[PDB]
Amino acid sequence: GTGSIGGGKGSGVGISTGGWVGGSHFSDKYVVTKNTRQFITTIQNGHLYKTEAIETTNQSGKSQRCVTTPWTYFNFNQYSCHFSPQDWQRLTNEYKRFRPKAMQVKIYNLQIKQILSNGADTTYNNDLTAGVHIFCDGEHAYPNASHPWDEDVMPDLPYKTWKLFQYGYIPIENELADLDGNAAGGNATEKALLYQMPFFLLENSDHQVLRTGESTEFTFNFDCEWVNNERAYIPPGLMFNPKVPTRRVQYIRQNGSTAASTGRIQPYSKPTSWMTGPGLLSAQRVGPQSSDTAPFMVCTNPEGTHINTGAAGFGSGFDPPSGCLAPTNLEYKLQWYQTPEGTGNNGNIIANPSLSMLRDQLLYKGNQTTYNLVGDIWMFPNQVWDRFPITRENPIWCKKPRADKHTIMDPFDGSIAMDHPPGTIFIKMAKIPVPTASNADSYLNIYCTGQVSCEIVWEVERYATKNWRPERRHTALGMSLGGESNYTPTYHVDPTGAYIQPTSYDQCMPVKTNINKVL
Amino acid sequence: GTGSIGGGKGSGVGISTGGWVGGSHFSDKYVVTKNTRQFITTIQNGHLYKTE
Amino acid sequence: RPERRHTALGMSLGGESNYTPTYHVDPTGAYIQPTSYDQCMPVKTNINKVL
């Protein structure tokens, strides 16, 4: 049902630079997702680079220093971006693993409008000679624009308008520069940090400038590890045959009155060579919602401790701490809101056990009498665990920090650590100077709308099982009713046009809950 | 991180006549500096040559 | 021996509240200027030549 486009192959105002793409194609080895959004970008910071310091004192809740830029950026990092709930269901039901392979982004059909405000009404007219600056940072030569679990992501519904967020970054750890700080300290390393605090201008590189008849296109080739969709039906410790005897001997030392005994290990409990995976349960969250509450605080202090007992502005919180361990409290569970309007207990989704036996692991230390839970299990030889089951609402990737030494990279939120994730596309409108009598900068008030199309080829692979029995699958019967009068199902739309969100973790259709693997 | 420019190679309103350049490249024998500014120019002297 | 070089450690703080270094920008977006001649990084101060 594709029409033949008429009109010449030329270019300019009155010729569109691309069409709308949408929908997925499933195959055995590949899944192709196509998504187009209409985006809107506006002037940021009045075309200025600014810095901001909180100066802590708990007013904001810690000490941050940020530089905000005139730029905005595209954030594609999330699965709901690329998959409809239908397509995500099909992916997690029909395939044991998948990874992104190739990516193609087009920015096209650009429209710059001048904003004319007279009194109480505002008008919008084309300025056809206005440009927009666009470039991708693929070298990661600038601070990353996006961080996992941000609300800046592409809209889930294809017909919603995507408003870009302002780009900004933290030039320095602000608590490490207290300025005067303490008087008898004679601050030096604090000034030394400020003198070498970097400053980044996107204007320091080459940009493409697009007028309304131009378009631009970016391609990216993923070299990626697979995200696996498989469930362990047993722990690795149960891989034995309980009827078979073992050669192994268990010596039990003298316990109180009970004499030291030796004997053959029972057939139904055979020793395992495989250990609980890493995780930290010992810490608890601190302080009011306003501060940084994470149970572990990862700080870098070059000088003399004194983290002000509340972590001050030193460091960032490490959450979730528990890793693959069974969370012993709600604090340790990954939790988010479906909507930027979510608050409190409304609109929040708590991650639930996937019922995979490589997750929710625990370690118990025997004394002579009993077993006690080991709070902090560190990285140890012979640990095996599965990754956090990712839903359609999880971030896809995180960027690996550039560093000399790193341990196993398995972010506990479930995002894939990548050496070179897709580059961020930065976009701002050309500053249009307005002639002014004084030296105060005045500019023309303009905004740009356009279409972005993302197209990802997913390398995918199906499952084969010798299991006799029907496996668990994701089904619409696990959905719930919502909206006004509560007659609208989960991924449907409200009578007001509101898109009903999943209220539970299973409605988000996590991976590793369905297809069984033999250990 | 340079995109492929779409739209025809023709000219007119709605086609930009260049991109933004910026940044330096250092070498042993050469340094290349690239700078772009946005300039504004206005009418001067009401289009007159005057003496003072 | 190590020769003299230009370093950011010769920069100074400026702007409002005077927490912004030399070539950085103010919270108001003002670009802090070098307040001294050495912050301008003159030539012929660093690399030695034998006469």
Coordinates of C-alpha atoms in Angstrom, one line a residue:
Chain A
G1 CA 0.0 0.0 0.0
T2 CA 2.9 2.3 -0.8
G3 CA 2.0 5.0 -3.3
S4 CA 4.2 6.3 -6.1
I5 CA 5.6 9.7 -5.0
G6 CA 5.1 12.4 -7.6
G7 CA 7.0 15.6 -8.1
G8 CA 10.6 15.9 -9.1
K9 CA 13.6 14.3 -7.3
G10 CA 14.9 17.8 -6.6
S11 CA 15.0 19.6 -3.2
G12 CA 13.8 22.7 -1.4
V13 CA 10.8 24.1 0.4
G14 CA 7.7 22.1 -0.6
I15 CA 9.6 18.7 -1.0
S16 CA 9.6 16.4 2.0
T17 CA 12.9 14.9 2.9
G18 CA 11.5 11.5 4.0
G19 CA 8.5 9.5 4.9
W20 CA 7.2 8.0 8.1
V21 CA 8.6 4.6 9.0
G22 CA 7.1 2.3 11.6
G23 CA 6.5 -1.3 12.6
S24 CA 8.6 -4.3 13.1
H25 CA 9.6 -7.3 10.9
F26 CA 10.3 -10.6 12.6
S27 CA 12.4 -13.4 11.2
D28 CA 14.4 -16.3 12.5
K29 CA 17.7 -14.5 12.6
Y30 CA 16.6 -10.9 12.6
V31 CA 14.1 -8.5 13.9
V32 CA 13.9 -5.0 12.3
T33 CA 12.3 -2.2 14.3
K34 CA 11.3 1.1 12.7
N35 CA 10.2 4.1 14.6
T36 CA 9.5 7.7 13.7
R37 CA 8.7 10.5 16.1
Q38 CA 7.8 14.1 15.7
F39 CA 10.2 16.1 17.9
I40 CA 10.2 19.7 19.0
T41 CA 13.3 21.6 20.1
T42 CA 13.5 25.1 21.6
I43 CA 16.1 27.6 22.6
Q44 CA 18.0 26.7 25.8
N45 CA 19.6 29.0 28.3
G46 CA 19.0 32.0 26.0
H47 CA 21.9 30.7 23.9
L48 CA 24.3 30.8 26.8
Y49 CA 26.7 28.4 28.5
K50 CA 26.0 28.8 32.3
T51 CA 27.3 27.1 35.4
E52 CA 25.4 26.6 38.6
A53 CA 26.5 25.6 42.1
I54 CA 24.1 24.6 44.9
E55 CA 26.5 25.2 47.8
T56 CA 24.9 22.3 49.6
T57 CA 23.6 23.2 53.1
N58 CA 20.8 20.6 52.4
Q59 CA 18.8 23.3 50.5
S60 CA 18.9 21.1 47.4
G61 CA 20.1 18.1 49.4
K62 CA 23.8 18.1 48.3
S63 CA 26.5 20.1 46.5
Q64 CA 26.2 20.0 42.7
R65 CA 27.9 22.1 40.1
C66 CA 26.6 21.9 36.6
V67 CA 27.2 23.7 33.3
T68 CA 24.1 23.9 31.2
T69 CA 24.4 24.4 27.5
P70 CA 22.2 25.9 24.7
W71 CA 22.1 22.4 23.2
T72 CA 19.5 19.6 23.3
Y73 CA 20.0 16.0 22.6
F74 CA 18.3 12.8 21.4
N75 CA 18.1 9.9 23.9
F76 CA 17.2 6.5 22.3
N77 CA 18.3 4.4 25.3
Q78 CA 15.3 2.2 26.4
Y79 CA 13.5 -0.8 24.9
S80 CA 10.0 0.8 25.0
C81 CA 11.5 3.2 22.5
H82 CA 12.1 0.4 19.9
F83 CA 9.4 -2.2 20.6
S84 CA 5.6 -2.0 20.9
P85 CA 4.2 -4.1 23.7
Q86 CA 3.1 -6.6 21.0
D87 CA 6.6 -6.8 19.5
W88 CA 8.2 -7.0 22.9
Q89 CA 5.9 -9.9 23.8
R90 CA 6.8 -11.7 20.6
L91 CA 10.5 -11.1 21.3
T92 CA 10.5 -12.4 24.8
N93 CA 8.2 -15.4 24.0
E94 CA 9.8 -16.6 20.8
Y95 CA 13.6 -16.0 21.2
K96 CA 16.2 -17.1 23.7
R97 CA 18.5 -14.2 23.0
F98 CA 18.8 -11.0 21.0
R99 CA 21.1 -8.1 20.5
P100 CA 21.1 -4.9 18.5
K101 CA 23.2 -5.2 15.3
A102 CA 22.9 -2.1 13.1
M103 CA 21.3 1.2 13.8
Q104 CA 20.2 4.0 11.5
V105 CA 18.9 7.4 12.5
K106 CA 17.4 10.0 10.2
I107 CA 16.5 13.6 11.1
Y108 CA 14.3 15.1 8.4
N109 CA 11.3 17.2 7.5
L110 CA 12.6 20.0 9.6
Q111 CA 10.5 23.0 10.3
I112 CA 11.8 26.2 11.9
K113 CA 9.0 28.6 13.0
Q114 CA 9.4 32.1 14.3
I115 CA 7.5 32.7 17.5
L116 CA 5.7 36.0 17.4
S117 CA 4.1 37.0 20.7
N118 CA 1.7 40.0 20.7
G119 CA -0.2 40.5 23.9
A120 CA -2.2 37.4 24.9
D121 CA -1.9 35.4 21.6
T122 CA 1.1 34.0 19.8
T123 CA 1.6 33.3 16.1
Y124 CA 3.9 30.9 14.3
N125 CA 5.3 31.6 10.9
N126 CA 8.0 29.9 8.8
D127 CA 11.5 31.4 8.6
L128 CA 12.8 29.3 5.7
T129 CA 16.4 30.4 5.9
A130 CA 16.9 29.4 9.5
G131 CA 19.1 26.4 10.3
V132 CA 19.5 23.8 13.0
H133 CA 22.9 22.5 14.1
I134 CA 23.1 18.8 14.4
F135 CA 26.0 16.5 15.1
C136 CA 26.5 13.1 16.6
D137 CA 29.3 12.6 19.2
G138 CA 30.5 9.2 18.3
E139 CA 34.0 9.6 19.7
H140 CA 32.5 10.4 23.1
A141 CA 34.8 13.4 23.1
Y142 CA 32.2 15.3 25.2
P143 CA 30.5 14.5 28.5
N144 CA 27.7 12.0 28.0
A145 CA 24.4 13.7 27.5
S146 CA 22.2 10.8 28.8
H147 CA 22.3 8.6 31.8
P148 CA 20.3 5.4 32.2
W149 CA 16.7 5.7 33.6
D150 CA 16.3 9.3 32.5
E151 CA 13.0 10.7 31.5
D152 CA 14.5 12.3 28.4
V153 CA 13.8 9.2 26.3
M154 CA 11.9 8.9 23.1
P155 CA 8.1 8.7 23.7
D156 CA 6.6 5.2 23.9
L157 CA 3.6 5.9 21.7
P158 CA 4.6 6.9 18.1
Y159 CA 2.1 9.7 17.9
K160 CA 3.3 11.6 21.0
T161 CA 5.6 14.6 20.5
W162 CA 9.1 14.2 21.7
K163 CA 10.4 17.3 23.5
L164 CA 14.2 17.3 23.8
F165 CA 15.9 18.0 27.1
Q166 CA 18.7 20.5 27.6
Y167 CA 22.2 19.1 27.6
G168 CA 24.4 19.7 30.7
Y169 CA 27.1 18.0 32.6
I170 CA 28.9 18.1 35.9
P171 CA 32.4 19.6 35.4
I172 CA 33.7 18.9 38.9
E173 CA 32.7 17.2 42.1
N174 CA 31.5 20.2 44.0
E175 CA 32.0 19.1 47.6
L176 CA 35.7 18.6 46.7
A177 CA 35.8 22.4 46.2
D178 CA 34.3 24.0 49.2
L179 CA 36.0 27.3 48.2
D180 CA 37.0 28.9 51.5
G181 CA 35.9 25.6 53.1
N182 CA 37.7 25.5 56.5
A183 CA 39.9 28.4 57.4
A184 CA 42.7 26.5 59.1
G185 CA 42.8 24.0 56.2
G186 CA 44.5 26.4 53.8
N187 CA 42.6 25.1 50.8
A188 CA 45.0 24.2 47.9
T189 CA 44.0 20.8 46.5
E190 CA 40.5 22.4 46.4
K191 CA 41.8 25.3 44.2
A192 CA 43.9 22.8 42.3
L193 CA 40.7 20.9 41.4
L194 CA 39.0 24.1 40.2
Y195 CA 41.9 25.3 38.1
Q196 CA 41.8 22.1 36.0
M197 CA 38.0 21.8 36.0
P198 CA 37.3 21.3 32.3
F199 CA 34.9 23.2 30.1
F200 CA 33.2 21.8 27.0
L201 CA 31.7 23.7 24.1
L202 CA 30.0 21.8 21.4
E203 CA 31.0 24.6 19.0
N204 CA 34.5 23.2 19.3
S205 CA 33.7 20.6 16.7
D206 CA 32.1 20.4 13.2
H207 CA 28.3 20.5 12.9
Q208 CA 25.9 19.9 10.1
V209 CA 23.6 22.9 9.6
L210 CA 20.2 21.9 8.2
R211 CA 17.6 24.2 6.7
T212 CA 14.0 23.0 6.1
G213 CA 14.7 21.2 2.8
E214 CA 17.8 19.4 4.1
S215 CA 17.9 16.1 6.1
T216 CA 20.7 14.2 7.9
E217 CA 21.3 10.6 8.6
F218 CA 23.5 8.6 11.1
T219 CA 24.4 5.0 11.1
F220 CA 25.9 2.8 13.9
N221 CA 27.1 -0.8 13.9
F222 CA 26.6 -2.5 17.2
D223 CA 29.2 -5.0 18.3
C224 CA 27.3 -6.3 21.3
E225 CA 26.9 -9.0 23.8
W226 CA 23.6 -10.9 23.8
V227 CA 20.9 -10.2 26.2
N228 CA 19.7 -13.7 27.1
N229 CA 16.1 -14.7 27.5
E230 CA 16.2 -18.0 29.4
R231 CA 15.2 -19.3 32.8
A232 CA 17.1 -21.6 35.1
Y233 CA 14.5 -24.1 36.5
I234 CA 17.0 -25.3 39.1
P235 CA 20.0 -23.8 40.9
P236 CA 23.4 -25.0 39.7
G237 CA 23.7 -26.8 43.1
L238 CA 20.9 -29.2 42.2
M239 CA 22.5 -30.6 39.0
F240 CA 23.2 -33.9 40.7
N241 CA 21.2 -37.2 40.8
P242 CA 19.9 -37.7 44.3
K243 CA 19.7 -41.5 43.9
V244 CA 23.4 -41.9 43.1
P245 CA 25.8 -42.2 46.1
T246 CA 28.8 -39.9 46.4
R247 CA 32.3 -40.8 47.3
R248 CA 32.7 -37.6 49.4
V249 CA 33.1 -37.6 53.1
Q250 CA 31.8 -35.0 55.6
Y251 CA 33.8 -34.7 58.8
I252 CA 31.9 -32.8 61.5
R253 CA 34.1 -31.5 64.3
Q254 CA 33.1 -32.0 67.9
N255 CA 30.3 -29.6 68.8
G256 CA 29.8 -29.3 72.6
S257 CA 28.5 -32.7 73.8
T258 CA 28.1 -34.0 70.3
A259 CA 31.2 -36.1 69.3
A260 CA 33.2 -35.5 66.2
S261 CA 31.7 -37.7 63.4
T262 CA 32.8 -38.6 59.9
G263 CA 30.6 -40.3 57.3
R264 CA 29.5 -40.4 53.7
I265 CA 27.8 -37.3 52.4
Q266 CA 24.1 -38.1 51.8
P267 CA 23.1 -38.7 48.2
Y268 CA 20.3 -36.2 48.2
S269 CA 22.6 -33.3 49.2
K270 CA 25.7 -33.4 47.1
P271 CA 28.4 -30.7 47.5
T272 CA 28.5 -28.1 44.8
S273 CA 31.4 -26.3 43.3
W274 CA 29.4 -23.2 42.5
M275 CA 28.9 -20.2 44.7
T276 CA 26.3 -17.5 45.2
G277 CA 26.9 -14.5 43.0
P278 CA 28.0 -11.2 44.3
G279 CA 25.8 -8.8 46.2
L280 CA 25.7 -6.4 49.2
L281 CA 22.8 -6.7 51.7
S282 CA 24.4 -5.1 54.7
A283 CA 23.7 -1.4 54.0
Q284 CA 20.4 0.4 54.5
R285 CA 19.2 3.7 53.0
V286 CA 19.7 6.9 55.0
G287 CA 18.0 10.2 55.5
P288 CA 15.0 11.9 54.0
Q289 CA 13.8 11.6 50.4
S290 CA 15.5 14.9 49.7
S291 CA 19.0 13.7 50.0
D292 CA 20.9 10.9 48.2
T293 CA 19.6 7.9 50.1
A294 CA 21.4 5.0 48.5
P295 CA 22.6 2.4 51.0
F296 CA 26.2 2.5 49.6
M297 CA 27.9 5.8 48.8
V298 CA 30.7 5.6 46.3
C299 CA 33.0 8.6 47.0
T300 CA 36.3 10.0 45.8
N301 CA 37.9 12.2 48.4
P302 CA 41.5 13.2 47.6
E303 CA 41.8 15.0 51.0
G304 CA 41.2 14.1 54.6
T305 CA 37.9 12.2 54.8
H306 CA 35.2 14.1 56.6
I307 CA 32.3 13.1 54.4
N308 CA 30.0 15.0 56.8
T309 CA 28.3 11.7 57.9
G310 CA 25.5 12.3 55.4
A311 CA 27.9 11.6 52.5
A312 CA 27.8 15.4 51.9
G313 CA 28.4 16.1 48.2
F314 CA 31.1 13.5 48.2
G315 CA 30.3 10.6 45.9
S316 CA 27.2 9.1 44.4
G317 CA 24.9 6.4 45.6
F318 CA 25.3 2.8 44.5
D319 CA 21.8 1.3 43.9
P320 CA 20.6 -1.4 43.7
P321 CA 23.3 -2.9 45.9
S322 CA 21.9 -6.5 46.1
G323 CA 23.1 -7.7 42.7
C324 CA 21.8 -11.2 42.1
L325 CA 21.1 -11.7 45.7
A326 CA 17.5 -12.2 46.9
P327 CA 16.5 -8.7 48.1
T328 CA 15.7 -8.8 51.8
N329 CA 13.7 -5.6 51.7
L330 CA 11.8 -3.2 49.4
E331 CA 14.8 -0.9 49.5
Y332 CA 17.0 -3.3 47.5
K333 CA 14.4 -3.8 44.6
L334 CA 14.7 -1.9 41.4
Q335 CA 11.8 0.5 41.3
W336 CA 10.7 3.3 38.9
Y337 CA 7.7 5.3 37.7
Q338 CA 6.0 4.7 34.4
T339 CA 5.2 8.4 34.1
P340 CA 7.0 11.6 34.9
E341 CA 3.8 12.5 36.8
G342 CA 4.2 9.5 39.1
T343 CA 4.5 10.3 42.8
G344 CA 4.4 8.2 46.0
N345 CA 2.8 4.8 45.6
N346 CA 1.0 5.9 42.5
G347 CA 2.5 4.8 39.2
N348 CA 5.5 2.9 40.6
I349 CA 6.7 -0.6 39.4
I350 CA 8.7 -2.8 41.8
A351 CA 10.8 -5.5 40.2
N352 CA 9.6 -8.9 41.3
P353 CA 11.4 -12.3 41.4
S354 CA 11.6 -13.7 37.9
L355 CA 11.5 -17.2 39.3
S356 CA 14.8 -18.0 37.6
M357 CA 17.1 -20.0 39.8
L358 CA 20.2 -18.0 38.8
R359 CA 18.6 -15.0 40.5
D360 CA 17.5 -14.4 44.1
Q361 CA 20.6 -16.2 45.4
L362 CA 21.5 -16.4 49.1
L363 CA 24.5 -17.5 51.1
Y364 CA 24.3 -18.9 54.6
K365 CA 27.3 -19.3 56.9
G366 CA 27.2 -22.2 59.2
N367 CA 28.3 -21.8 62.7
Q368 CA 28.2 -25.2 64.5
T369 CA 24.5 -24.8 65.6
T370 CA 22.8 -23.0 62.7
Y371 CA 23.1 -21.1 59.4
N372 CA 23.1 -17.4 59.2
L373 CA 22.7 -15.2 56.1
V374 CA 25.9 -13.8 54.8
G375 CA 25.3 -10.1 54.3
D376 CA 28.1 -9.0 52.0
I377 CA 29.1 -11.6 49.4
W378 CA 31.9 -10.3 47.3
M379 CA 33.2 -11.4 44.0
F380 CA 34.5 -15.0 44.5
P381 CA 35.7 -17.8 42.3
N382 CA 33.1 -20.1 40.9
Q383 CA 30.2 -17.6 41.1
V384 CA 27.6 -17.9 38.4
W385 CA 24.5 -15.7 38.2
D386 CA 22.1 -14.5 35.5
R387 CA 21.7 -10.8 34.7
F388 CA 18.9 -8.7 36.1
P389 CA 15.8 -9.6 34.0
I390 CA 15.1 -6.6 31.8
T391 CA 11.7 -5.3 30.9
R392 CA 10.6 -3.2 28.0
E393 CA 11.0 -0.2 30.3
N394 CA 14.6 -0.8 31.1
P395 CA 17.5 1.2 29.6
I396 CA 19.4 -0.8 26.9
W397 CA 23.0 0.3 27.4
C398 CA 25.3 2.2 29.7
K399 CA 28.7 3.4 28.6
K400 CA 31.7 1.7 30.2
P401 CA 33.8 4.3 32.0
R402 CA 37.2 4.8 30.4
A403 CA 39.5 3.4 33.1
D404 CA 42.7 1.3 33.4
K405 CA 41.2 -1.6 35.4
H406 CA 37.7 -3.0 35.7
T407 CA 36.1 -6.1 37.1
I408 CA 33.2 -8.0 35.5
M409 CA 30.8 -5.5 34.1
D410 CA 27.2 -6.4 35.0
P411 CA 25.3 -3.3 35.9
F412 CA 22.7 -4.3 38.5
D413 CA 19.9 -2.2 36.8
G414 CA 20.3 -4.6 33.9
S415 CA 21.7 -2.2 31.2
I416 CA 24.4 -3.5 29.0
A417 CA 27.8 -1.9 29.6
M418 CA 29.3 -0.9 26.2
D419 CA 32.7 0.5 25.3
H420 CA 31.2 2.6 22.5
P421 CA 27.4 2.9 22.7
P422 CA 25.6 4.8 19.9
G423 CA 26.8 8.4 19.9
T424 CA 24.5 11.1 21.2
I425 CA 22.9 13.3 18.6
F426 CA 23.0 16.9 19.7
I427 CA 20.8 19.5 18.2
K428 CA 20.2 23.2 18.7
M429 CA 18.8 25.9 16.5
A430 CA 21.1 28.5 15.0
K431 CA 21.3 31.5 17.2
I432 CA 19.7 34.2 15.1
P433 CA 21.0 37.6 16.2
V434 CA 18.6 40.5 16.5
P435 CA 20.1 44.0 16.0
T436 CA 20.0 45.8 19.3
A437 CA 21.0 49.3 20.3
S438 CA 22.9 48.2 23.4
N439 CA 25.4 45.4 23.7
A440 CA 23.0 43.1 25.5
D441 CA 22.5 40.1 23.3
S442 CA 19.0 39.7 21.8
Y443 CA 18.0 36.9 19.5
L444 CA 15.1 35.8 17.3
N445 CA 12.7 33.5 19.1
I446 CA 12.4 30.4 17.0
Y447 CA 11.7 26.7 17.5
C448 CA 12.3 23.6 15.4
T449 CA 10.1 20.6 14.8
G450 CA 11.0 17.7 12.7
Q451 CA 10.9 13.9 12.3
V452 CA 13.4 11.5 13.7
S453 CA 13.3 7.9 12.4
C454 CA 15.3 5.2 14.2
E455 CA 15.8 1.8 12.6
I456 CA 17.5 -1.0 14.4
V457 CA 18.4 -4.4 13.0
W458 CA 18.3 -6.9 15.9
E459 CA 20.2 -10.1 15.7
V460 CA 18.0 -12.7 17.3
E461 CA 18.0 -16.4 17.8
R462 CA 15.2 -18.8 18.6
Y463 CA 15.1 -21.6 21.2
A464 CA 14.9 -25.3 21.0
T465 CA 14.0 -27.4 24.0
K466 CA 13.6 -31.1 24.9
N467 CA 11.2 -30.1 27.6
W468 CA 7.9 -32.1 27.3
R469 CA 5.7 -29.6 29.2
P470 CA 4.3 -26.2 28.2
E471 CA 6.6 -23.4 29.3
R472 CA 5.4 -20.1 30.8
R473 CA 4.7 -17.3 28.4
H474 CA 3.7 -13.7 28.5
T475 CA 0.0 -13.3 28.0
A476 CA -2.5 -10.4 27.9
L477 CA -4.4 -12.2 30.6
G478 CA -1.9 -10.8 33.1
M479 CA -2.9 -7.3 32.2
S480 CA -5.1 -5.1 34.4
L481 CA -7.9 -2.5 33.9
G482 CA -7.2 1.2 34.3
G483 CA -8.2 4.7 33.2
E484 CA -11.3 6.5 34.1
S485 CA -14.1 4.0 35.2
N486 CA -11.3 1.4 35.0
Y487 CA -12.5 -0.3 31.9
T488 CA -9.4 0.2 29.8
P489 CA -6.7 -2.5 29.6
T490 CA -3.0 -1.9 30.1
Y491 CA -1.5 -0.9 26.8
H492 CA -4.8 0.6 25.5
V493 CA -5.8 4.2 25.6
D494 CA -8.2 6.0 28.0
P495 CA -11.4 7.7 26.9
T496 CA -9.4 10.9 27.5
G497 CA -6.7 9.6 25.3
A498 CA -4.4 8.7 28.2
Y499 CA -2.2 5.7 27.7
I500 CA -2.7 3.2 30.5
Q501 CA 0.6 2.1 32.0
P502 CA 1.5 -1.3 33.3
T503 CA 0.9 -1.3 37.0
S504 CA 3.0 -4.4 37.7
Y505 CA 6.4 -5.7 36.9
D506 CA 5.0 -8.7 35.0
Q507 CA 2.9 -6.5 32.8
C508 CA 6.2 -5.0 31.6
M509 CA 7.1 -8.5 30.4
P510 CA 10.6 -9.1 31.8
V511 CA 13.0 -11.6 30.2
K512 CA 14.3 -14.8 31.6
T513 CA 10.9 -15.7 33.0
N514 CA 9.7 -18.0 30.1
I515 CA 12.1 -20.2 28.1
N516 CA 13.8 -22.9 30.2
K517 CA 17.5 -23.8 29.8
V518 CA 19.2 -26.9 31.1
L519 CA 22.1 -25.9 33.3
Chain B
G1 CA 30.0 11.5 14.0
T2 CA 29.3 13.3 10.8
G3 CA 25.8 12.5 9.3
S4 CA 24.9 12.0 5.7
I5 CA 23.3 15.2 4.4
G6 CA 20.0 14.5 2.7
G7 CA 18.3 16.6 0.2
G8 CA 19.4 17.5 -3.3
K9 CA 22.7 19.1 -4.2
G10 CA 20.8 22.1 -5.6
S11 CA 20.5 25.6 -4.2
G12 CA 18.0 28.1 -2.9
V13 CA 16.0 29.0 0.1
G14 CA 15.8 26.0 2.4
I15 CA 19.3 24.6 1.6
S16 CA 22.1 25.6 3.8
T17 CA 25.3 26.7 2.1
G18 CA 27.7 25.2 4.7
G19 CA 28.1 23.6 8.0
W20 CA 29.7 24.6 11.3
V21 CA 33.4 24.0 11.5
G22 CA 35.3 24.1 14.7
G23 CA 38.3 22.7 16.6
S24 CA 41.9 22.2 16.0
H25 CA 44.1 19.4 14.7
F26 CA 47.7 19.2 16.0
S27 CA 50.5 17.4 14.1
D28 CA 54.3 17.6 14.1
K29 CA 54.5 19.9 11.1
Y30 CA 51.1 21.5 11.0
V31 CA 48.3 22.8 13.2
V32 CA 44.9 23.4 11.6
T33 CA 42.5 25.7 13.4
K34 CA 38.8 25.9 12.4
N35 CA 36.5 28.6 13.7
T36 CA 32.9 29.5 12.8
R37 CA 31.1 32.5 14.2
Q38 CA 27.6 33.9 13.7
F39 CA 27.9 37.5 12.7
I40 CA 25.3 40.3 12.5
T41 CA 25.7 43.4 10.3
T42 CA 23.4 46.4 10.2
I43 CA 23.0 49.5 8.1
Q44 CA 25.7 52.1 8.8
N45 CA 25.5 55.9 8.4
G46 CA 22.0 55.6 6.8
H47 CA 23.8 54.4 3.6
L48 CA 25.9 57.6 3.4
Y49 CA 29.5 58.5 3.2
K50 CA 30.1 61.3 5.8
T51 CA 33.1 63.2 7.0
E52 CA 33.6 64.5 10.5
Chain C
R1 CA 66.2 19.4 33.7
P2 CA 62.4 19.9 33.4
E3 CA 61.6 23.2 31.6
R4 CA 58.9 25.7 32.6
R5 CA 55.5 25.1 31.1
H6 CA 52.1 26.7 31.1
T7 CA 49.8 25.1 33.6
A8 CA 46.2 25.6 34.7
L9 CA 47.6 25.9 38.2
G10 CA 48.5 29.5 37.4
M11 CA 44.9 30.4 36.8
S12 CA 42.7 32.3 39.3
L13 CA 39.1 32.2 40.5
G14 CA 36.6 34.8 39.4
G15 CA 33.0 35.5 38.7
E16 CA 30.3 35.9 41.2
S17 CA 31.2 34.3 44.5
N18 CA 34.7 33.8 42.9
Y19 CA 34.4 30.1 42.4
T20 CA 34.9 30.1 38.6
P21 CA 38.3 29.5 37.1
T22 CA 39.9 31.7 34.4
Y23 CA 38.6 30.4 31.1
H24 CA 35.4 28.9 32.5
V25 CA 32.0 30.5 32.5
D26 CA 30.2 32.3 35.3
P27 CA 26.9 31.2 36.7
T28 CA 25.5 34.1 34.8
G29 CA 27.2 32.9 31.6
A30 CA 29.9 35.5 31.9
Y31 CA 33.3 34.3 30.5
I32 CA 36.0 34.8 33.1
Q33 CA 38.9 36.6 31.7
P34 CA 42.6 36.1 32.6
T35 CA 43.5 38.7 35.2
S36 CA 47.3 38.4 34.8
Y37 CA 49.8 38.3 31.9
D38 CA 50.9 34.7 32.6
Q39 CA 47.3 33.5 32.4
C40 CA 47.4 34.7 28.9
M41 CA 50.3 32.2 28.3
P42 CA 52.9 34.3 26.6
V43 CA 55.5 32.8 24.3
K44 CA 59.3 32.6 24.9
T45 CA 58.7 31.7 28.6
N46 CA 59.1 28.0 28.4
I47 CA 61.4 26.2 25.9
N48 CA 65.1 27.0 26.4
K49 CA 67.5 27.7 23.6
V50 CA 71.2 27.6 23.7
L51 CA 72.6 31.0 22.6

